[PDB]
Write an enzyme that holds these catalytic residues in place. Structure first.
Site, PDB file in Angstrom:
ATOM      1  N   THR A 154       0.779  -1.232   0.000  1.00  0.00           N
ATOM      2  CA  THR A 154       0.000   0.000   0.000  1.00  0.00           C
ATOM      3  C   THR A 154       0.816   1.291   0.000  1.00  0.00           C
ATOM      4  OG1 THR A 154      -1.980  -1.043   0.929  1.00  0.00           O
ATOM      5  CG2 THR A 154      -1.786   1.297   1.191  1.00  0.00           C
ATOM      6  N   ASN A 198       5.847  -1.925   3.589  1.00  0.00           N
ATOM      7  CA  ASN A 198       4.992  -1.452   4.685  1.00  0.00           C
ATOM      8  C   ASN A 198       5.736  -1.571   6.021  1.00  0.00           C
ATOM      9  OD1 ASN A 198       2.750  -0.638   3.091  1.00  0.00           O
ATOM     10  ND2 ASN A 198       1.558  -2.511   3.558  1.00  0.00           N
ATOM     11  N   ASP A 250      -9.793  -3.119  -0.131  1.00  0.00           N
ATOM     12  CA  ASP A 250      -8.681  -3.893   0.430  1.00  0.00           C
ATOM     13  C   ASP A 250      -9.075  -4.558   1.751  1.00  0.00           C
ATOM     14  OD1 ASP A 250      -6.065  -3.615   2.509  1.00  0.00           O
ATOM     15  OD2 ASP A 250      -5.401  -4.133   0.547  1.00  0.00           O
ATOM     16  N   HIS A 260      -8.854  -8.764   2.003  1.00  0.00           N
ATOM     17  CA  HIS A 260      -7.988  -9.562   2.863  1.00  0.00           C
ATOM     18  C   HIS A 260      -8.784 -10.654   3.590  1.00  0.00           C
ATOM     19  CE1 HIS A 260      -4.038  -7.634   2.647  1.00  0.00           C
ATOM     20  NE2 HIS A 260      -4.640  -6.456   2.632  1.00  0.00           N
ATOM     21  N   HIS A 276      -3.114  -1.076  -5.915  1.00  0.00           N
ATOM     22  CA  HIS A 276      -2.688  -2.454  -6.178  1.00  0.00           C
ATOM     23  C   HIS A 276      -3.937  -3.328  -6.138  1.00  0.00           C
ATOM     24  CE1 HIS A 276      -3.392  -3.264  -1.978  1.00  0.00           C
ATOM     25  NE2 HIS A 276      -2.578  -2.277  -1.646  1.00  0.00           N
ATOM     26  N   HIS A 302      -1.742  -9.192  -1.087  1.00  0.00           N
ATOM     27  CA  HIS A 302      -1.100  -8.558  -2.232  1.00  0.00           C
ATOM     28  C   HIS A 302       0.351  -8.300  -1.836  1.00  0.00           C
ATOM     29  CE1 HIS A 302      -1.544  -4.762   0.087  1.00  0.00           C
ATOM     30  NE2 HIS A 302      -2.640  -5.373   0.512  1.00  0.00           N
ATOM     31  N   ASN A 328      26.786  -1.193  -9.451  1.00  0.00           N
ATOM     32  CA  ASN A 328      26.265  -0.572  -8.215  1.00  0.00           C
ATOM     33  C   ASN A 328      24.745  -0.582  -8.134  1.00  0.00           C
ATOM     34  OD1 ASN A 328      25.730   1.365 -10.099  1.00  0.00           O
ATOM     35  ND2 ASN A 328      26.637   3.051  -8.979  1.00  0.00           N
ATOM     36  N   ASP A 372      22.144   0.639  -9.556  1.00  0.00           N
ATOM     37  CA  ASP A 372      21.334   1.843  -9.410  1.00  0.00           C
ATOM     38  C   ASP A 372      20.415   2.098 -10.593  1.00  0.00           C
ATOM     39  OD1 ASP A 372      23.218   2.773 -11.356  1.00  0.00           O
ATOM     40  OD2 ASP A 372      23.759   4.508 -10.120  1.00  0.00           O
ATOM     41  N   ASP A 421      27.009   2.381 -15.764  1.00  0.00           N
ATOM     42  CA  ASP A 421      28.242   2.573 -15.003  1.00  0.00           C
ATOM     43  C   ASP A 421      29.274   3.360 -15.813  1.00  0.00           C
ATOM     44  OD1 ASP A 421      27.134   0.972 -12.987  1.00  0.00           O
ATOM     45  OD2 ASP A 421      28.530  -0.666 -13.324  1.00  0.00           O
TER      46      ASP A 421
END
Ligand SMILES: *[C@@H]1O[C@H](CO)[C@@H](O[C@@H]2O[C@H](CO)[C@@H](O[C@@H]3O[C@H](CO[C@H]4O[C@H](CO)[C@@H](O)[C@H](O[C@H]5O[C@H](CO)[C@@H](O)[C@H](O)[C@@H]5O[C@H]5O[C@H](CO)[C@@H](O)[C@H](O)[C@@H]5O)[C@@H]4O)[C@@H](O)[C@H](O[C@H]4O[C@H](CO)[C@@H](O)[C@H](O)[C@@H]4O[C@H]4O[C@H](CO)[C@@H](O)[C@H](O)[C@@H]4O)[C@@H]3O)[C@H](O)[C@H]2NC(C)=O)[C@H](O)[C@H]1NC(C)=O
Ligand SMILES: Cc1nnc(-c2cccc(C3=Nc4ccc(-c5ccccc5F)cc4NC(=O)C3)c2)o1
Ligand SMILES: [Ca+2]
Ligand SMILES: [Cl-]
Ligand code: NA
Ligand code: NA
Ligand SMILES: [Zn+2]
EC number: 3.1.4.39
Length: 808
Positions: free
Chosen positions: A159, A180, A261, A265, A309, A420, A685, A687, A691
């Protein structure tokens, strides 16, 4: 400490938050236990409910009431949302036929169409169709406005990562809310759904929409709502803010629903209990649209209905337990559930070893329902590695499953039927997007897109300059009637050299050999033309890629392929070739098995050498343009040039060889020819970004030949596959991948079988957007097409997901 003795008189849902210990009256005071003593009495009135009835029409204003049906209620801005319907013979918005909104129809004093975001937690994409019969307001928004069949969330499909991505345009690894639950080792602090650490600003990176707005002089409603404030009161509060004086009134607002949601659940995504929560959400939408109609704003406001989601079927009994795999289960900490994140329980434990943990979790049980990864090995499309809050060990859990540390965590910490968090390409995790209003298009369906793109559009809708983010601004212009953002292509930074023949064979001492001394004014003039680019129009269909960083590289032409060869990395940045539907696959001839040939256009000093590969016992080599797809025996010799060679672990060559020998031809058959651009990627790295030369951690032993972390391919064809790839008049179709260059195939549990049983599955897991490859390489593709630039930006953000249809 809080001094709750102040009062909320005339401050109910005030927009500026007051500083402690002064008591608060804003929509989050409850969550901080800081509301003034009279907040409930004054700000959360409930008397007489939320609807006008015939007998309240004209009633004498009684300020105790939750909302009003007195004659003065419109000028006060606080009528019940159904007031004009009950008391003034009006229709509900949902009962009016939809009429195109060609221009904003706004009351005097409105400087711009306001934006209202109506955000729903756990609203799975398939609910739009499967629940359409009980959601008439939402279905009207959907059919009359602009909608996607679904919108892709970010990973993990939890979430707060998704809500904050919606607010910032950033991947979780960049905005910092990576789950979360989180542990930050630099702060030595934990973030939890429950508690007060999560309020500390330090967790929340980037720049969210409400801050971007305020800095640019656009006022914002407060986006967050304490759970206990009922939805009806959220809507009334927004409608009251919209009646403020021009100088005080916000231009952007957010409503948030904890449903569906919450019930998902408990009951699963399609449990029969789920109908009521969908009805109730719809009712809330109806209240908003009715209230907007009342204020004469229903043809002025842009409304976004968006989810964070979806929701999948998950039960207690589908849990994998790490205690069934690991000897040392109490030496680890596990963040559990629909993903796993593992780290050492104590930093003082000298016998903690991630390699041994990974191995114990790898392909141990036949139907094992999770797979371990060092995070840098996760699919690059997840963009889930570059943050200290993401643990080095990650478990990708199969849809419908959980992972937990030990069974007692699951019964003594059944209940739940939905959850989820899984991989964001999973169909059940997809969510919704609908835009409705003067700035959106009318009765328009657009293809699915990623939620990272929305921040830019919300900024366009409000006239804001977006903070730097991970959207590709312009890729969603086709959703908009006006306010499109018209980007220019980035400038090329490095121009290529075009070398001719400059070196004799004897100047090379690369330790290579080739049996190529076999050999006419006919096709000698002709091969000279090929080396000067005479077939380049066939193999470079969308222009040469632009190099967007400073470097030194050569364009090299050949009969069957064209390349951009880096003198710095000693290999191509990109190799481009077209394979028609009619192309034939051939073998590598016996006498050419180990053939590698000096390239007389490129200096020995800027070439790879074969001796390095001989001496590096771990490393072999492959080719970017595949010798299997040579157009003729004579052309095939070009494929064995040293300038077409790249370093490959033998394990990886299994994958690559199958891709090049089998799959390319298969795709050319299925798609009516394909254009392929392949190349290396270096991201040591992790990211997500190209590089530089000084970031490279591994070389072919003894040499300056850098080892790629990944190999990519971009495979383009005509969307109208009745046209050949090389003669396409219209829109393009693309699929791409970024394959990890790994020394083993431990990722693929069935890799001991024939490549036909596992390689393609691997490639689908590592599907990518062209845009991902652009970040990773500093290249800009598709520079010369006949297509509009926005259309091309959309193409570049496309992800081919290989999921079945949504709905069956
Ligand atoms: C998705 O889009 C985003 C946004 O566009 C892209 O992220 C950007 O990428 C840039 C390159 O990685 C990066 O630029 C750097 O900025 C540094 C200053 O950053 C601070 O200030 C900004 C501005 O307000 C702020 O946004 C930053 O926020 C980060 O960190 C805070 C905590 O401090 C978090 O709250 C926040 O969530 C965010 O964390 C994320 O980013 C950081 C990196 O900044 C990661 O470490 C986290 O894991 C997380 O992912 C910061 O508060 C600036 O200092 C850098 O300059 C160095 O590098 C340049 C390169 O040109 C070099 O010339 C300089 O010398 C300098 O090096 C020096 O420091 C080095 C490290 O200590 C040292 O080794 C050297 O020797 C030198 O001393 C750099 O320019 C930019 O910050 C982020 N922005 C954001 C919002 O994340 C992202 O790339 C996109 N993704 C993809 C795949 O495309
Ligand atoms: C600071 C801080 N620390 N904790 C909280 C806190 C406490 C309780 C609830 C929330 C919620 N926050 C968000 C986040 C994002 C969006 C959003 C939705 C669509 C598009 C763009 C968006 F930004 C709507 C939200 N509204 C909610 O009510 C849920 C937050 O705040
Ligand atoms: Ca990098
Ligand atoms: Cl309180
Ligand atoms: Na070798
Ligand atoms: Na394997
Ligand atoms: Zn949930």
């Amino acid at each position: 400490w809080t001094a709750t003795s102040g009062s909320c008189k005339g401050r109910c849902f005030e927009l500026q938050e007051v500083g402690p210990p002064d008591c608060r009256c804003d929509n989050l005071c409850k969550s901080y236990s800081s509301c003034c003593h009279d907040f409930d009495e004054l700000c959360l009135k409930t008397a007489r409910g939320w609807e006008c009835t015939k007998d309240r029409c004209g009633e004498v204003r009684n300020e105790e009431n939750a909302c009003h049906c007195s004659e003065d209620c419109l000028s006060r801005g606080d009528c019940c949302t159904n007031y004009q319907v009950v008391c003034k013979g009006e229709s509900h918005w949902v009962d009016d036929d939809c009429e195109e909104i060609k221009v904003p129809e706004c009351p005097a004093g409105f400087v711009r169409p306001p934006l209202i975001i109506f955000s729903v937690d756990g609203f799975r994409a398939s609910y739009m169709k499967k629940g359409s019969k009980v959601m008439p307001n939402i279905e009207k928004l959907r059919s009359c406005g602009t909608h996607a069949p679904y919108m892709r969330p970010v990973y993990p499909t939890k979430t707060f990562p998704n809500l904050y991505t919606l607010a910032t345009g950033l991947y979780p690894e960049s905005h910092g809310i990576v789950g979360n639950s989180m542990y930050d080792p630099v702060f030595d602090a934990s973030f939890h759904l429950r508690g007060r650490e999560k309020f500390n600003h330090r967790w929340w990176g980037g720049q969210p929409l409400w801050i971007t707005a305020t800095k640019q002089g656009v006022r914002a409603g407060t986006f967050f709502w304490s759970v206990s404030i009922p939805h009806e009161r959220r809507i009334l509060t927004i409608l009251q803010w919209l009646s403020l004086p021009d100088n005080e009134r916000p231009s952007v607002y957010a409503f948030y629903s904890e449903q569906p949601d919450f019930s998902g659940h408990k009951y699963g995504p399609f449990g029969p209990e789920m109908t009521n929560p969908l009805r109730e959400i719809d009712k809330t939408v109806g209240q908003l649209m009715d209230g907007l109609k009342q204020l004469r704003l229903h043809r002025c406001v842009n409304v976004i209905f968006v989810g964070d989601h979806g929701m999948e079927d998950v039960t207690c009994d589908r849990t994998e337990f790490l205690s069934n795999y690991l000897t040392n289960v109490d030496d680890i900490t596990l963040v559990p559930g629909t993903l796993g994140r593992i780290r050492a329980k104590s930093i003082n434990n000298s016998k903690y070893d991630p390699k041994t943990i990974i191995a114990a979790l790898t392909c141990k049980k036949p139907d094992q329902h999770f797979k371990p990864y060092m995070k840098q090995h996760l699919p690059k499309r997840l963009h889930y590695a570059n943050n200290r809050r993401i643990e080095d060990i990650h478990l990708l859990v199969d849809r419908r499953w959980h992972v937990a540390r030990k069974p007692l965590d699951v019964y003594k910490k059944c209940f739940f039927q939905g959850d989820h968090g899984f991989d964001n390409k999973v169909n059940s995790m997809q969510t919704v997007f609908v835009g409705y209003g003067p700035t959106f298009k009318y009765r328009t369906k657009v293809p699915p897109f990623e939620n990272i793109e929305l921040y830019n559009v919300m900024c366009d809708l409000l006239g804001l300059k977006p903070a730097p983010n991970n959207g590709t601004h312009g890729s969603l212009n086709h959703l908009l009637r006006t306010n499109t953002f018209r980007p220019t292509m980035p400038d090329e930074v490095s121009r290529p050299n075009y070398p001719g023949i400059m070196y004799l064979q004897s100047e090379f001492d690369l330790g290579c050999t080739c049996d190529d001394k076999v050999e006419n004014k006919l096709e000698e003039l002709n091969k000279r033309l090929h080396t000067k680019g005479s077939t380049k129009e066939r193999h470079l269909l969308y222009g040469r890629p632009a190099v967007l960083y400073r470097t030194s590289y050569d364009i090299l032409y050949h009969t069957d392929f064209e390349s951009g060869y880096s003198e710095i990395f000693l290999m191509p940045l990109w190799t481009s070739y077209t394979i028609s539907k009619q192309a034939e696959v051939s073998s590598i001839p016996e006498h050419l098995t180990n053939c590698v040939r000096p390239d007389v256009r490129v200096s020995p000093g800027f070439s790879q050498n074969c001796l390095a590969y001989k001496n590096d016992k771990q490393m072999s080599y492959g080719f970017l343009f595949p010798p299997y797809l040579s157009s003729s025996p004579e052309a095939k010799y070009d494929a064995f040039l040293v300038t077409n060679m790249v370093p490959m672990y033998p394990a990886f060559k299994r994958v690559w060889a199958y891709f090049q020998r089998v799959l390319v031809k298969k795709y050319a058959s299925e798609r009516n020819g394909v254009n392929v651009i392949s190349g290396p990627i270096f991201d040591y790295n992790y990211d997500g970004l190209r590089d530089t030369e000084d970031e490279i951690k591994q070389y072919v032993e003894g040499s300056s030949i850098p080892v790629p972390t990944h190999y990519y391919s971009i495979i383009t064809s005509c969307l109208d596959f009745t046209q050949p790839a090389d003669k396409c008049d219209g829109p393009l179709s693309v699929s791409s991948f970024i394959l990890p260059h790994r020394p083993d195939n431990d990722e693929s549990c069935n890799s001991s079988e024939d490549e036909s049983k596992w390689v393609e599955e691997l490639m689908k897991m590592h599907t990518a957007r062209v845009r991902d490859i652009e970040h990773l390489t500093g290249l800009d593709f598709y520079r010369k097409t006949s297509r509009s630039y926005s259309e091309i930006l959309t193409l570049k953000t496309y992800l081919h997901t290989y999921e079945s249809e949504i709905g069956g």
